[PDB]
Amino acid sequence: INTITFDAGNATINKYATFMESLRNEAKDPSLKCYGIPMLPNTNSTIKYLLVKLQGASLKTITLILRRNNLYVMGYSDPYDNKCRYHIFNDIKGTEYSDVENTLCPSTNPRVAKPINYNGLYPTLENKAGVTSRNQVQLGIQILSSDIGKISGQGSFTEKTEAKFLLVAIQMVPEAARFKYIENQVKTNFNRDFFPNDKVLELEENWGKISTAIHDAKNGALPKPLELKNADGTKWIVLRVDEIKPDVGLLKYVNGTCQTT
Ligand SMILES: *[C@@H]1O[C@H](CO)[C@@H](O)[C@H](O)[C@H]1NC(C)=O
């Protein structure tokens, strides 16, 4: 399967929806699903990485590389100085590392490294972005396009600029694929900058717990109450798969059989 592209400089809600549908369709294991929700593959599947090319209104691009099995961003590349410049997180090493480097920038064309001197965990990114919480960093289509312009092809840019771009891209691409609720936040705020609400953050932080609960659910009942948060930050108690299913687009891989429909 090849590169999925999203044009943030010429986007519409329908194009963003199509993009999410393509990302989910290529990331999901061809057959795993629980309660009708597609699940990502185990660590030894057919295709290991997905490339997602984002284009800004400047026409410049940034391509993210996602580990297909869990959708984490491994790094990104940008066309720079007539070379392919690859930026990989500092905890990616060995095989994986050279696999990421070569997938972003094939050894048959000019290339150059520009390390990401930190890892991709949210607290790390928030620290580099200079915020106590990513809910202080606005998301949005125009913001994504602008961040692409600030980095792509640029010989110089700060870690703060890069970490903010990463906070935006991670949440508008893989988190939105994982959660229809997040995709929907982008679609209902399509023409404006917006701060992610408490439910967005809570879903991002509990994807594994939510995926395990749905996978382990019997006749639609979660193993035990699942405590999350409503959009306004208040406590939300979920007892059944159907109460949370509307918000979920992809399940993290959970071993073993499950009620598939
Ligand atoms: C995964 O599940 C199968 C299918 O039930 C089981 O044979 C295997 O023990 C499990 N793997 C792990 C690590 O628990």
Short mmCIF file of C-alpha atoms and ligand atoms in Angstrom, two decimals:
data_model
loop_
_atom_site.label_atom_id
_atom_site.label_comp_id
_atom_site.label_asym_id
_atom_site.label_seq_id
_atom_site.Cartn_x
_atom_site.Cartn_y
_atom_site.Cartn_z
CA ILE A 1 0.00 0.00 0.00
CA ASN A 2 1.33 3.45 -0.63
CA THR A 3 1.48 7.03 0.64
CA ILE A 4 -1.69 8.55 1.98
CA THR A 5 -1.89 12.28 1.24
CA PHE A 6 -3.84 15.04 2.91
CA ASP A 7 -3.83 18.57 1.46
CA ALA A 8 -4.32 20.95 4.42
CA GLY A 9 -4.03 23.95 2.11
CA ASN A 10 -7.06 22.98 0.01
CA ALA A 11 -9.16 21.02 2.47
CA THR A 12 -12.83 20.49 3.15
CA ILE A 13 -14.59 18.48 5.86
CA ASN A 14 -15.36 15.80 3.28
CA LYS A 15 -11.70 15.57 2.21
CA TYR A 16 -10.61 15.25 5.85
CA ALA A 17 -13.23 12.51 6.38
CA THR A 18 -11.95 10.66 3.32
CA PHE A 19 -8.40 10.99 4.60
CA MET A 20 -9.41 9.46 7.97
CA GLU A 21 -11.23 6.66 6.19
CA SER A 22 -8.13 5.91 4.06
CA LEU A 23 -5.86 5.97 7.10
CA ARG A 24 -8.14 3.59 9.04
CA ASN A 25 -8.56 1.28 6.07
CA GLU A 26 -4.82 0.96 5.48
CA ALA A 27 -3.83 0.71 9.14
CA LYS A 28 -6.34 -1.88 10.32
CA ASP A 29 -5.64 -5.58 10.31
CA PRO A 30 -7.62 -6.95 7.31
CA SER A 31 -9.78 -9.10 9.57
CA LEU A 32 -9.53 -8.17 13.25
CA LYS A 33 -12.48 -6.26 14.70
CA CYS A 34 -14.46 -6.31 17.95
CA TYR A 35 -18.08 -5.14 18.14
CA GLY A 36 -17.70 -3.96 14.57
CA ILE A 37 -14.73 -1.71 15.33
CA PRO A 38 -11.60 -2.41 13.33
CA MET A 39 -8.46 -3.35 15.24
CA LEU A 40 -4.80 -2.74 14.35
CA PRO A 41 -2.55 -5.75 13.64
CA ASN A 42 -0.13 -7.58 15.89
CA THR A 43 3.60 -6.67 15.76
CA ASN A 44 4.36 -9.14 12.98
CA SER A 45 2.04 -8.11 10.13
CA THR A 46 2.48 -7.81 6.36
CA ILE A 47 3.35 -4.10 6.13
CA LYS A 48 5.25 -2.41 8.98
CA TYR A 49 4.92 1.29 8.21
CA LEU A 50 2.54 3.84 6.69
CA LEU A 51 3.65 7.13 5.16
CA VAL A 52 1.27 10.10 5.43
CA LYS A 53 2.19 13.13 3.34
CA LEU A 54 0.73 16.42 4.57
CA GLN A 55 0.72 19.39 2.24
CA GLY A 56 0.42 22.99 3.37
CA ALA A 57 -1.04 26.02 1.58
CA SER A 58 2.58 26.94 0.75
CA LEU A 59 2.59 23.72 -1.31
CA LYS A 60 5.48 22.47 0.86
CA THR A 61 5.06 19.05 2.43
CA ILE A 62 5.96 17.00 5.47
CA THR A 63 5.63 13.25 5.48
CA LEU A 64 4.98 11.43 8.77
CA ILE A 65 5.95 7.79 9.12
CA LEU A 66 3.61 5.74 11.33
CA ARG A 67 4.28 2.31 12.74
CA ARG A 68 1.36 0.50 11.29
CA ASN A 69 0.68 -1.81 14.20
CA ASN A 70 0.07 0.87 16.82
CA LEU A 71 0.01 4.10 14.75
CA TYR A 72 2.77 5.84 16.72
CA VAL A 73 4.70 8.49 14.82
CA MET A 74 8.35 7.39 14.38
CA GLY A 75 9.51 10.61 12.75
CA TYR A 76 8.96 12.63 9.59
CA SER A 77 10.71 13.85 6.47
CA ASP A 78 10.67 17.00 4.41
CA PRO A 79 12.15 17.99 1.03
CA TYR A 80 15.19 20.05 2.02
CA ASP A 81 17.95 21.55 -0.04
CA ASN A 82 17.45 19.04 -2.86
CA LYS A 83 17.64 16.12 -0.48
CA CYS A 84 15.13 14.18 1.60
CA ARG A 85 15.66 15.26 5.21
CA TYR A 86 14.63 12.70 7.84
CA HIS A 87 13.84 13.55 11.46
CA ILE A 88 13.62 10.59 13.80
CA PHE A 89 12.83 10.54 17.53
CA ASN A 90 15.76 9.85 19.82
CA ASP A 91 14.46 6.58 21.22
CA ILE A 92 14.13 4.89 17.82
CA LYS A 93 17.21 2.72 17.30
CA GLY A 94 18.85 -0.20 15.46
CA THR A 95 16.75 -2.06 12.89
CA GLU A 96 13.62 0.02 13.28
CA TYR A 97 15.72 3.13 13.01
CA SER A 98 17.34 2.34 9.69
CA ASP A 99 13.97 0.92 8.54
CA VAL A 100 12.38 4.28 9.40
CA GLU A 101 15.25 6.21 7.81
CA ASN A 102 15.08 4.24 4.57
CA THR A 103 11.29 4.31 4.36
CA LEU A 104 11.20 8.08 4.81
CA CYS A 105 14.17 8.68 2.51
CA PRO A 106 15.31 5.91 0.17
CA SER A 107 19.06 5.39 -0.12
CA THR A 108 18.77 5.75 -3.90
CA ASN A 109 18.20 9.55 -3.63
CA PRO A 110 20.09 12.27 -1.71
CA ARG A 111 19.26 12.46 1.96
CA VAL A 112 20.37 14.01 5.21
CA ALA A 113 19.53 13.46 8.84
CA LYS A 114 18.14 16.11 11.17
CA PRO A 115 17.46 14.26 14.44
CA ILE A 116 14.55 14.97 16.72
CA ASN A 117 16.57 15.28 19.93
CA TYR A 118 13.81 14.02 22.21
CA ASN A 119 11.13 11.33 22.21
CA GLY A 120 7.52 11.51 21.03
CA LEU A 121 5.69 11.07 24.36
CA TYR A 122 3.15 13.79 25.12
CA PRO A 123 4.86 15.11 28.25
CA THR A 124 8.12 15.38 26.29
CA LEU A 125 6.42 17.27 23.49
CA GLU A 126 4.57 19.60 25.89
CA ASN A 127 7.88 20.42 27.63
CA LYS A 128 9.56 21.18 24.29
CA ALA A 129 6.53 23.22 23.24
CA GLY A 130 6.81 25.25 26.45
CA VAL A 131 3.35 24.38 27.80
CA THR A 132 2.16 22.61 30.93
CA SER A 133 -0.49 20.80 28.83
CA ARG A 134 -1.12 20.35 25.12
CA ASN A 135 -4.60 21.75 25.75
CA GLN A 136 -2.72 25.09 25.55
CA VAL A 137 -1.70 24.32 21.93
CA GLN A 138 -4.38 24.99 19.36
CA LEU A 139 -5.31 22.46 16.68
CA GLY A 140 -6.78 23.27 13.31
CA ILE A 141 -6.46 22.93 9.56
CA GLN A 142 -4.90 26.37 9.10
CA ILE A 143 -2.55 25.77 12.03
CA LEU A 144 -1.41 22.45 10.51
CA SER A 145 -0.78 24.12 7.16
CA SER A 146 1.14 26.94 8.83
CA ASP A 147 3.30 24.60 10.88
CA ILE A 148 4.21 22.69 7.71
CA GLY A 149 5.37 26.01 6.22
CA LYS A 150 7.50 26.80 9.30
CA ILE A 151 9.44 23.57 9.08
CA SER A 152 9.37 22.11 5.61
CA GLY A 153 12.40 23.08 3.55
CA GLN A 154 13.67 25.35 6.33
CA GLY A 155 17.33 25.20 7.33
CA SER A 156 16.50 26.51 10.75
CA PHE A 157 13.61 26.07 13.12
CA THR A 158 13.34 25.63 16.87
CA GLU A 159 12.50 22.57 18.91
CA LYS A 160 9.51 24.52 20.23
CA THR A 161 8.25 25.00 16.66
CA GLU A 162 8.84 21.35 15.85
CA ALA A 163 7.23 20.02 19.05
CA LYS A 164 4.15 22.17 18.48
CA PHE A 165 3.92 20.88 14.93
CA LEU A 166 4.18 17.34 16.30
CA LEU A 167 1.47 17.92 18.89
CA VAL A 168 -0.80 19.15 16.10
CA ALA A 169 0.03 16.45 13.56
CA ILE A 170 -0.15 13.58 16.04
CA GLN A 171 -3.53 14.61 17.27
CA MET A 172 -4.97 15.52 13.85
CA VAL A 173 -3.69 12.38 12.15
CA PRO A 174 -3.19 9.24 14.23
CA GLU A 175 -5.32 10.25 17.23
CA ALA A 176 -8.13 11.27 14.90
CA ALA A 177 -7.84 7.89 13.14
CA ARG A 178 -8.04 6.13 16.53
CA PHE A 179 -10.95 8.22 17.69
CA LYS A 180 -13.92 9.28 15.56
CA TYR A 181 -14.59 11.76 18.41
CA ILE A 182 -11.30 13.54 17.68
CA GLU A 183 -11.90 13.46 13.90
CA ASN A 184 -15.28 14.99 14.67
CA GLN A 185 -13.77 17.75 16.81
CA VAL A 186 -11.66 18.73 13.75
CA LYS A 187 -14.69 18.58 11.41
CA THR A 188 -16.90 20.69 13.70
CA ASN A 189 -14.12 23.28 14.10
CA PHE A 190 -12.93 22.99 10.55
CA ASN A 191 -12.65 26.69 9.87
CA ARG A 192 -11.13 27.77 13.19
CA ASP A 193 -8.30 27.21 15.63
CA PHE A 194 -9.44 25.23 18.67
CA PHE A 195 -8.00 23.90 21.92
CA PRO A 196 -8.51 20.19 22.53
CA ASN A 197 -11.08 19.63 25.24
CA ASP A 198 -10.70 17.33 28.25
CA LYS A 199 -12.45 14.43 26.53
CA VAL A 200 -9.97 14.61 23.64
CA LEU A 201 -7.07 14.35 26.07
CA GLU A 202 -8.63 11.60 28.13
CA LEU A 203 -9.42 9.47 25.09
CA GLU A 204 -5.84 9.91 23.80
CA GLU A 205 -4.45 8.83 27.17
CA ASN A 206 -6.70 5.78 27.54
CA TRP A 207 -6.82 4.24 24.07
CA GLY A 208 -5.26 1.03 25.40
CA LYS A 209 -7.62 0.74 28.34
CA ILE A 210 -10.61 1.43 26.07
CA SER A 211 -9.40 -1.06 23.45
CA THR A 212 -8.83 -3.81 26.04
CA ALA A 213 -12.28 -3.17 27.59
CA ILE A 214 -14.09 -3.40 24.27
CA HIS A 215 -12.08 -6.46 23.22
CA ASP A 216 -12.84 -8.20 26.54
CA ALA A 217 -16.54 -7.20 26.69
CA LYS A 218 -19.15 -9.99 26.98
CA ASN A 219 -22.49 -9.45 25.21
CA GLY A 220 -21.58 -5.78 24.98
CA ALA A 221 -20.84 -5.33 28.71
CA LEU A 222 -17.38 -3.98 29.61
CA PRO A 223 -15.46 -6.16 32.18
CA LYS A 224 -15.81 -3.38 34.74
CA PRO A 225 -16.85 0.28 34.74
CA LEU A 226 -14.60 2.38 32.52
CA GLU A 227 -14.06 5.87 33.96
CA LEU A 228 -13.34 8.61 31.42
CA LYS A 229 -14.28 12.25 30.97
CA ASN A 230 -16.95 14.26 29.23
CA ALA A 231 -16.10 17.19 26.98
CA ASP A 232 -16.29 19.57 29.97
CA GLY A 233 -13.90 17.51 32.04
CA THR A 234 -16.53 15.91 34.28
CA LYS A 235 -16.47 12.23 35.14
CA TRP A 236 -18.00 9.86 32.62
CA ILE A 237 -18.72 6.21 33.56
CA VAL A 238 -18.97 3.77 30.68
CA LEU A 239 -20.42 0.27 31.24
CA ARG A 240 -21.24 -0.92 27.72
CA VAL A 241 -19.45 -1.04 24.38
CA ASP A 242 -22.24 0.91 22.67
CA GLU A 243 -21.79 3.90 24.97
CA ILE A 244 -18.20 4.44 23.77
CA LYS A 245 -18.19 2.86 20.31
CA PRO A 246 -19.36 6.09 18.57
CA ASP A 247 -16.13 7.78 19.68
CA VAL A 248 -13.79 5.03 18.52
CA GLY A 249 -12.35 4.57 15.06
CA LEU A 250 -9.64 1.91 15.63
CA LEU A 251 -8.82 -0.47 18.44
CA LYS A 252 -5.25 -0.97 19.67
CA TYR A 253 -4.21 -4.58 19.09
CA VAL A 254 -5.46 -6.85 21.89
CA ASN A 255 -4.58 -10.56 21.72
CA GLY A 256 -7.19 -13.32 21.68
CA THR A 257 -10.67 -13.68 20.20
CA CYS A 258 -13.49 -11.26 20.91
CA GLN A 259 -17.12 -10.76 19.92
CA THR A 260 -16.47 -9.46 16.43
CA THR A 261 -19.87 -7.94 15.71
C1 LIG B 1 -2.54 -14.83 22.21
O1 LIG B 1 -3.76 -15.56 22.04
C2 LIG B 1 -3.75 -16.93 21.56
C3 LIG B 1 -5.10 -17.10 20.88
O2 LIG B 1 -5.82 -17.33 22.08
C4 LIG B 1 -2.91 -17.69 22.60
O3 LIG B 1 -2.67 -18.96 22.00
C5 LIG B 1 -1.55 -17.06 22.91
O4 LIG B 1 -1.16 -17.62 24.17
C6 LIG B 1 -1.65 -15.55 23.25
N1 LIG B 1 -0.36 -14.87 23.28
C7 LIG B 1 -0.07 -14.32 24.46
C8 LIG B 1 1.28 -13.61 24.56
O5 LIG B 1 -0.63 -14.22 25.57
#
